[PDB]
């Protein structure tokens, strides 16, 4: 359950669906952003299809 | 300090629900939806297939 990038416990923690895996929010928005693409797949991802993860 | 909402302990093998954004440990949600047809937080419809694994 660490972020795939910074390989810390997220402030934020949001999961992308063509992933599967878990990424701080903006270190994904970041991403998506200026690629419209998952950083680990390589496949097209929106802002809106990232889910945020309601915190415990 | 991402928390099963069920059990409230680190989950061995993290789920995510996409209804209620929420992660649990799948061995239990697994059994909350096979017993009830539902998300544990909305209650809303939930099949299996539906809960997103988390990948390590």
């Known amino acids: 359950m660490l972020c ?3 390989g810390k416990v997220p ?3 949001v ?3 063509k992933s599967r ?3 701080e929010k903006s270190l994904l ?3 998506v952003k200026d690629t419209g ?3 680990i ?3 097209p ?8 993860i309601v915190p415990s």
């Not at 991802?45 to 945020?52: D, F, G, T, W, Y």
């Open 4 to 6: 795939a990038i910074s």
């Open 11 to 13: 402030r934020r923690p």
């Open 15 to 17: 999961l992308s669906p």
């Open 21 to 23: 895996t878990i990424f």
């Open 29 to 31: 928005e970041q991403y």
């Open 37 to 39: 693409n998952d950083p």
């Open 41 to 43: 797949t390589n496949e």
């Open 45 to 52: 991802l929106s802002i809106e299809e990232i889910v945020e």
